[PDB]
């Protein structure tokens, strides 16, 4: 729960930024979630990006997250025959179900 | 010792030079009884004249910056010092080490009482901003946001919630709004806990060696790191009797000769920093006053928490 | 006292080029030298919400805002020409020999007992089945994976190159020569004595295979999808690509391998399915089911060392197995 | 102010001194034989054993470095599946018999190597005791990587007697085995004086050079070489 | 007493430059000079299973749940275009002499000792038999190391740049000039004088080697391999990563020169084999296994000790190894 609060933290600390970083140029600059990632965006522009996060309604970033986080389990098969994997998955979709469920509620 | 019928929000202010020695075992973040004397002053000033109650404040610290330098050699650290002025012989005086620091705050306020039926709730919320704003916090002048480019009004919002799931969005966007910082909760039941888990390892275990090993940095050999649930700062929980409760007008050199005086200790619990997320409710991370004045024990904690 | 070696890392054989498509007509393929490559094109898809939900999706009001904004795609798209009915593939595979000796090999006393026991059973069984069922792989056009799944008429031209130059020629019909049943046939004889000369080093073997499908006229083939690191939008979010070498669709080598290695018959379960891949616990990734599992002793380790270090020979189709994942190559050893 | 020996190490002094703020200073040095290490700057006013423990992290640093540097190999005695490791056991030097090996059903033991390329051998439980006797690596083997070959060697045509630095490393003071000077004496047989000149290097005088015998039951008692 | 030095770090002769991978044709190796180079380009792989099961993993279930995550990976993948059947590999080759003189040595007397005994070397036998060794292994492409595995036919040109331009000009056959016999030719024999005249000092020899391998057209061809750091995703994992100078493949020039190196058929082991890499204590990466061990007295540090120290001369063959050491050069001595 922490490392998502810690990414929460992130995003916050990401309001503290520049309002229009993600509409800079860049041939990789993670667009996937960029629409987290600055959410002043949509004060910048008027319909070019501001529809698109209230329609697309962004939370599978954390998905991309999960997988992150995927990286950050050991690779034991023990774990993986026993059910310690499976409370691990368990205890993983539960916690990035809430943190998609606060990220999608971010156009309030 | 009450629930909340509203939370009012003050935004980021920023503290110039709060008192950075919370108590005479902790320095860094100010004390929380410094937060609960200021929502008390704010309720002294404007809070009577707007037919409201102002009882409970959480804390979510905004940003920290410690007027503080690490002299070489040494892994501790000093507190820079302010030049006072020199005596009337011309001599440098005796100086007091006194550490600042510059905090950037948000302060939830549980407000009660008909006046919130009286006023609008911007207007309320107005008139307890622009009192807060020419006050302080922990001894250190609130700077009220001067010339930048976007100033933040307060949002005082009702804990009244028509619905259940109102409820949950307006205390979700509250959280929102109150984002980047950790809300610092009480946690008397942990350190009980810890402190009967220690006296299980080891007898005559004082709460003062439980709250010191939730404090340090635990090595293990097998060498690892004994980990902690949160961050679990050691905080100044209260203040417990040293005297009686002498009359009004016995103790000489007194504050007012009016309100009685009692000599106290400081009383060291401890706290924890936790990112505002992880709470039920806002209002579990309200700061209350406890006094119990015949036993001494006059406290500040965050009850209904958990 | 023969242990088995930690490394057991064996080069393959039967090695295959990347195998290029065109488009063109059929009855034109006698002229289809210069057919124009298939390009891979890109294409815009928007979609509806149509995966199984999880019982919270399902709410009325919930997936009526899904359906309101539907996903947003740029997939690649291979499509023949309007005027071409008719899909080319051209490969060459080189077939090397020396299937036994491994490149690189810790114990020399485990080298020198596995090649003796290759040896033997080049000695009593030459590479004679193994080749007639890698021969009847390409004699069918399992190397167009999907891409024969719909097509009214397959056919396959195997050349062989001596000196630059034609030698043996060996125009096929991949209709005929099923994809379950391993028969004999004249010309699939001559291929496999090919193939069993160049499995068997006695000569050097390059065949050039290609493959006419007849699917449709500007239809949809299917080259080897390549991946895709998602590092752009998402309405154009390029949720797949297709591979290509220059300008000019194609599949990948491998993918043409694992077509040639579907020759095991030989799995414990039952085979009225048809064949699979030569593999070690026979693995098929389309039906997620390992036969030769482990359990049942008929996988490709179990075997090999009950062959080598214990002297159990195992049955004939199964060392037949054996030896073919020997040809197929691997990391054979600790891994 | 002058060198501090610790271990093999000498905290070197810089003779020339500095006045960093208003207080002096010195650049000390931390010298693993021939080649320094980590340099600060010391202000005088440090106590010698300030100056030590101040480089003491250095000197752990390099101790444990070195006992990572010269791990001995370590083999496994597994089953006939070979995944369960029943036994492992520090090797000193590798048996000249292994080869690339996994473990077969057909034997109930098998010993292999820690690395992934298992190089191993098909044992019984007795060989397995036989091999462990004759080639198990001492607690402090790890000393024997920063020891050159040729003070090693157990042919005495090829044996060069060891320096006032080698001999240095495991006699006394803040050693790597950890041993005084007496308790190296003692358990050499002989009093400390005469101990002393073996330890002693330098000029001729007090150079008494250590014998090859003595060396290495020296290391045979302090369990760095041929202690198995 | 007369001690080995210290320090006694030696250059290497015969050093290599690095060799380019280009594309082509048969027959077209006359005017070869503007052929497109070999570009690494990058391919997706799908995985199954395929490695050993540590008894834990060979579970039905969980073997299944392995096949159900294929491992998906890009590999860095080295082709010829498909008009193109032929791999050109050019390097060039300097042989420097001097090989009796250390780089470093501590001991004057020992250098003047070494120097004495390469001079009384040279004396009874010149660098004749390792010239001829290193001129069959320029002869026979062993430098192109699984371009050769193979190949149907490979040819190898090397031209004596004496001032920048071709001083004497050689032609062979790779395939006819084994991996396994040191026998006489007179070009061979004339590469071998050149290589002399380099080794012993009596001039400069720059060679420029062009390598040609009937592959076949579209296969892969087989450059050095990288080393990879493992810091990306699983997905895009890059388990293979080629050699490449500026868009054009290369194998790395160390490789080349162990090639070359590879003379060795003085090692007390059988002729199984056949030459090895001179090496100290005859090291084989591929077999895991060292020939010239230490404890069968025909290391190079046992024969150079017993040579030099105490006259104790081995046999020519045992000579010619320990000078063909010298001519490897290597960081000798004690740390």
């Given at each position: 729960?922490?490392?998502?609060?810690e990414?929460?933290?992130?995003?916050?600390?990401?309001?503290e930024?520049?309002?229009?970083?993600?509409?800079?140029?860049?041939?990789?600059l993670?667009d996937?979630?960029?629409?987290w990632?600055?959410?002043?965006?949509?004060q910048?522009?008027?319909?070019?990006?501001?529809?698109?996060?209230?329609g697309?309604?962004?939370?599978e970033?954390?998905?991309?997250?999960?997988?992150?986080?995927n990286?950050?389990?050991?690779?034991?098969?023990?774990?993986?025959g026993?059910?310690?994997?499976?409370?691990?998955?368990?205890?993983?979709?539960?916690?990035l179900?809430?943190?998609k469920?606060?990220?999608?509620?971010e156009?309030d | 010792?009450?629930?909340?019928?509203?939370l009012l929000?003050?935004?980021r202010?920023?503290?110039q030079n709060?008192?950075?020695?919370?108590?005479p075992?902790t320095?860094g973040?100010?004390?929380?009884?410094?937060?609960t004397?200021?929502?008390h002053?704010?309720?002294?000033?404007?809070?009577?004249?707007l037919?409201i109650?102002?009882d409970?404040?959480?804390?979510?610290?905004?940003?920290?910056?410690?007027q503080?330098?690490?002299?070489?050699?040494?892994?501790?650290?000093v507190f820079?010092?302010?030049?006072?002025?020199?005596?009337?012989?011309?001599?440098?005086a005796?100086?007091?080490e006194?550490?600042?620091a510059?905090?950037?705050?948000?302060?939830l306020?549980?407000?009660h009482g008909?006046?919130?039926?009286?006023?609008?709730?911007?207007?309320?919320?107005?008139?307890?901003?622009?009192?807060?704003?020419?006050?302080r916090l922990?001894?250190?002048?609130i700077?009220?946001?001067?010339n930048?480019?976007?100033?933040?009004?307060?949002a005082?919002?009702?804990?009244?919630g028509?619905?259940?799931?109102q409820?949950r969005?307006?205390?979700?966007?509250?959280?929102?709004?109150?984002?980047?910082?950790?809300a610092?909760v009480s946690?008397?039941?942990?350190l009980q806990?810890h402190?009967?888990?220690?006296?299980?390892?080891?007898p005559?275990?004082?709460?003062?060696?439980?709250?010191?090993?939730?404090?340090?940095?635990?090595?293990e050999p097998?060498?690892?790191?004994?980990?902690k649930?949160?961050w679990?700062?050691?905080?100044?929980?209260?203040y417990?009797?040293?005297?009686?409760?002498?009359?009004?007008?016995?103790?000489?050199?007194?504050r007012?000769?009016e309100?009685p005086?009692?000599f106290?200790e400081n009383?060291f619990?401890l706290?924890?920093?936790?990112?505002?997320?992880?709470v039920?409710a806002?209002?579990?991370?309200?700061?209350?006053?406890?006094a119990?004045?015949?036993?001494?024990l006059?406290?500040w904690?965050?009850?209904?928490?958990? | 006292?023969?242990?088995?070696?930690?490394?057991?890392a064996?080069?393959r054989?039967?090695?295959?080029?990347?195998?290029?498509?065109?488009?063109?007509?059929?009855?034109?393929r006698?002229?289809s030298?210069?057919?124009?490559?298939?390009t891979?094109?890109?294409?815009?898809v928007?979609?509806?919400?149509?995966?199984?939900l999880?019982?919270?999706?399902?709410?009325?009001?919930?997936?009526?805002?899904s359906?309101?904004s539907?996903?947003?795609?740029?997939?690649?798209?291979?499509?023949?020409?309007?005027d071409?009915?008719?899909?080319?593939?051209?490969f060459?595979?080189?077939?090397?020999?020396?299937?036994?000796?491994?490149?690189?090999?810790?114990?020399?006393?485990?080298?020198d007992?596995?090649?003796?026991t290759?040896?033997?059973?080049?000695?009593?069984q030459g590479?004679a089945?193994?080749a007639?069922?890698?021969?009847?792989?390409?004699?069918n056009?399992r190397?167009?994976?999907?891409?024969?799944?719909?097509?009214?008429?397959?056919?396959?031209?195997?050349?062989?190159?001596r000196?630059?130059?034609?030698?043996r020629?060996?125009?096929?019909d991949a209709?005929?020569?099923?994809?379950?049943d391993?028969?004999?046939?004249?010309?699939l004889?001559a291929?496999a004595?090919?193939?069993?000369?160049?499995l068997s080093?006695?000569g050097?073997?390059?065949?050039?295979?290609?493959?006419?499908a007849r699917?449709?006229?500007?239809?949809?083939?299917?080259?080897?999808?390549?991946?895709?690191?998602?590092?752009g939008?998402?309405?154009?979010?390029?949720?797949?690509?297709?591979?290509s070498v220059?300008?000019?669709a194609?599949?990948?080598?491998?993918?043409?391998?694992?077509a040639?290695?579907?020759?095991?018959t030989?799995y414990?379960?039952?085979?009225?399915?048809?064949?699979?891949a030569v593999?070690?616990?026979?693995?098929?990734?389309?039906?997620?089911?390992?036969?030769?599992?482990?359990?049942?002793?008929?996988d490709?380790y179990?075997?090999?060392?009950?062959?080598?270090?214990?002297?159990?020979?195992p049955?004939?189709?199964?060392?037949?197995?054996?030896?073919?994942?020997?040809?197929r190559?691997?990391?054979?050893?600790?891994? | 102010?002058?060198?501090?020996?610790?271990?093999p190490?000498?905290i070197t002094?810089?003779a020339?001194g500095l006045?960093?703020?208003?207080?002096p200073?010195?650049?000390?040095?931390?010298?693993?034989?021939p080649?320094?290490?980590?340099?600060?700057?010391?202000?005088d006013?440090?106590?010698?054993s300030?100056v030590?423990?101040e480089?003491?992290?250095?000197?752990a640093?390099?101790?444990?470095?070195?006992?990572?540097?010269?791990?001995?190999?370590?083999?496994?005695?597994?089953?006939?599946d070979?995944?369960?490791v029943?036994?492992?056991?520090?090797?000193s030097?590798?048996?000249?018999?292994?080869?690339?090996?996994?473990?077969?059903?057909r034997?109930?033991?098998?010993?292999?190597?820690?690395?992934?390329?298992?190089?191993?051998?098909?044992?019984?439980?007795?060989?397995?005791?036989?091999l462990?006797?004759?080639?198990?690596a001492?607690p402090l083997?790890?000393?024997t990587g920063l020891?050159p070959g040729?003070?090693?060697?157990?042919?005495?045509?090829?044996?060069?007697?060891?320096?006032?630095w080698?001999?240095?490393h495991?006699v006394?003071?803040?050693?790597?085995?950890?041993?005084?000077?007496?308790?190296?004496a003692a358990?050499?047989?002989?009093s400390?004086?005469?101990?002393?000149?073996?330890?002693?290097?330098?000029?001729?005088?007090?150079?008494?050079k250590i014998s090859?015998?003595?060396?290495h039951?020296?290391?045979?008692?302090?369990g760095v070489?041929?202690?198995?």
């Amino acid at each position: 729960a922490q490392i998502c609060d810690e990414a929460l933290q992130y995003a916050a600390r990401l309001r503290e930024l520049e309002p229009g970083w993600s509409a800079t140029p860049g041939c990789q600059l993670h667009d996937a979630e960029q629409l987290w990632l600055d959410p002043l965006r949509a004060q910048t522009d008027e319909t070019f990006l501001q529809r698109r996060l209230r329609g697309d309604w962004p939370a599978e970033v954390g998905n991309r997250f999960a997988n992150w986080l995927n990286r950050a389990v050991s690779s034991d098969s023990q774990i993986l025959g026993s059910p310690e994997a499976a409370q691990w998955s368990q205890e993983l979709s539960k916690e990035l179900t809430m943190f998609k469920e606060i990220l999608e509620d971010e156009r309030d | 010792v009450t629930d909340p019928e509203a939370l009012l929000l003050l935004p980021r202010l920023s503290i110039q030079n709060a008192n950075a020695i919370s108590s005479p075992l902790t320095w860094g973040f100010p004390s929380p009884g410094a937060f609960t004397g200021f929502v008390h002053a704010l309720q002294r000033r404007v809070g009577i004249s707007l037919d409201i109650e102002l009882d409970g404040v959480g804390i979510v610290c905004h940003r920290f910056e410690a007027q503080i330098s690490q002299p070489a050699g040494k892994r501790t650290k000093v507190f820079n010092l302010t030049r006072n002025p020199l005596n009337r012989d011309g001599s440098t005086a005796a100086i007091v080490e006194e550490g600042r620091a510059h905090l950037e705050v948000s302060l939830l306020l549980g407000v009660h009482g008909d006046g919130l039926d009286d006023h609008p709730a911007q207007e309320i919320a107005r008139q307890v901003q622009e009192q807060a704003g020419a006050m302080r916090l922990a001894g250190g002048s609130i700077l009220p946001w001067c010339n930048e480019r976007f100033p933040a009004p307060n949002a005082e919002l009702l804990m009244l919630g028509g619905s259940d799931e109102q409820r949950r969005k307006n205390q979700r966007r509250l959280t929102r709004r109150l984002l980047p910082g950790f809300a610092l909760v009480s946690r008397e039941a942990l350190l009980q806990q810890h402190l009967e888990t220690l006296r299980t390892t080891l007898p005559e275990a004082t709460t003062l060696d439980a709250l010191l090993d939730l404090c340090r940095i635990n090595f293990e050999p097998p060498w690892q790191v004994r980990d902690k649930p949160g961050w679990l700062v050691p905080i100044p929980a209260g203040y417990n009797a040293l005297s009686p409760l002498y009359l009004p007008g016995e103790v000489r050199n007194a504050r007012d000769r009016e309100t009685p005086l009692r000599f106290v200790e400081n009383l060291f619990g401890l706290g924890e920093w936790l990112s505002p997320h992880r709470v039920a409710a806002l209002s579990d991370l309200l700061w209350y006053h406890h006094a119990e004045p015949d036993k001494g024990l006059y406290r500040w904690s965050t009850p209904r928490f958990v | 006292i023969l242990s088995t070696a930690s490394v057991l890392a064996f080069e393959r054989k039967l090695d295959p080029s990347d195998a290029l498509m065109s488009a063109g007509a059929w009855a034109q393929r006698d002229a289809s030298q210069e057919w124009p490559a298939v390009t891979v094109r890109e294409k815009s898809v928007r979609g509806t919400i149509s995966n199984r939900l999880k019982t919270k999706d399902r709410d009325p009001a919930k997936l009526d805002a899904s359906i309101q904004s539907p996903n947003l795609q740029t997939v690649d798209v291979a499509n023949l020409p309007s005027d071409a009915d008719t899909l080319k593939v051209r490969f060459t595979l080189r077939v090397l020999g020396g299937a036994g000796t491994p490149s690189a090999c810790n114990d020399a006393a485990y080298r020198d007992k596995l090649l003796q026991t290759v040896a033997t059973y080049v000695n009593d069984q030459g590479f004679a089945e193994l080749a007639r069922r890698y021969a009847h792989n390409l004699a069918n056009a399992r190397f167009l994976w999907r891409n024969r799944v719909g097509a009214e008429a397959v056919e396959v031209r195997i050349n062989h190159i001596r000196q630059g130059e034609v030698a043996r020629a060996w125009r096929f019909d991949a209709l005929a020569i099923g994809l379950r049943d391993f028969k004999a046939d004249a010309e699939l004889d001559a291929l496999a004595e090919l193939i069993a000369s160049g499995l068997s080093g006695s000569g050097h073997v390059l065949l050039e295979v290609v493959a006419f499908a007849r699917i449709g006229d500007g239809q949809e083939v299917f080259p080897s999808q390549e991946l895709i690191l998602d590092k752009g939008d998402k309405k154009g979010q390029k949720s797949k690509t297709l591979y290509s070498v220059r300008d000019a669709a194609a599949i990948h080598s491998q993918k043409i391998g694992n077509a040639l290695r579907t020759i095991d018959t030989w799995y414990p379960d039952e085979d009225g399915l048809g064949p699979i891949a030569v593999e070690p616990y026979g693995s098929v990734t389309s039906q997620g089911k390992a036969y030769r599992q482990p359990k049942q002793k008929l996988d490709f380790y179990t075997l090999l060392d009950n062959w080598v270090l214990r002297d159990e020979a195992p049955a004939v189709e199964q060392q037949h197995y054996v030896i073919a994942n020997l040809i197929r190559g691997g990391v054979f050893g600790e891994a | 102010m002058n060198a501090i020996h610790i271990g093999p190490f000498s905290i070197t002094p810089a003779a020339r001194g500095l006045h960093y703020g208003g207080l002096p200073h010195h650049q000390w040095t931390l010298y693993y034989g021939p080649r320094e290490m980590a340099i600060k700057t010391l202000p005088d006013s440090y106590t010698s054993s300030e100056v030590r423990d101040e480089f003491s992290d250095i000197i752990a640093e390099f101790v444990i470095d070195a006992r990572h540097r010269y791990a001995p190999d370590v083999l496994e005695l597994v089953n006939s599946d070979g995944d369960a490791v029943l036994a492992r056991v520090a090797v000193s030097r590798l048996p000249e018999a292994l080869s690339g090996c996994i473990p077969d059903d057909r034997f109930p033991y098998w010993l292999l190597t820690a690395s992934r390329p298992r190089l191993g051998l098909p044992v019984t439980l007795n060989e397995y005791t036989a091999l462990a006797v004759e080639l198990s690596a001492p607690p402090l083997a790890w000393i024997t990587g920063l020891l050159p070959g040729e003070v090693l060697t157990h042919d005495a045509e090829e044996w060069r007697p060891p320096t006032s630095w080698e001999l240095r490393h495991v006699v006394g003071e803040g050693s790597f085995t950890g041993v005084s000077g007496a308790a190296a004496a003692a358990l050499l047989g002989m009093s400390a004086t005469n101990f002393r000149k073996y330890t002693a290097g330098d000029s001729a005088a007090n150079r008494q050079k250590i014998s090859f015998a003595a060396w290495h039951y020296l290391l045979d008692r302090l369990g760095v070489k041929r202690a198995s």
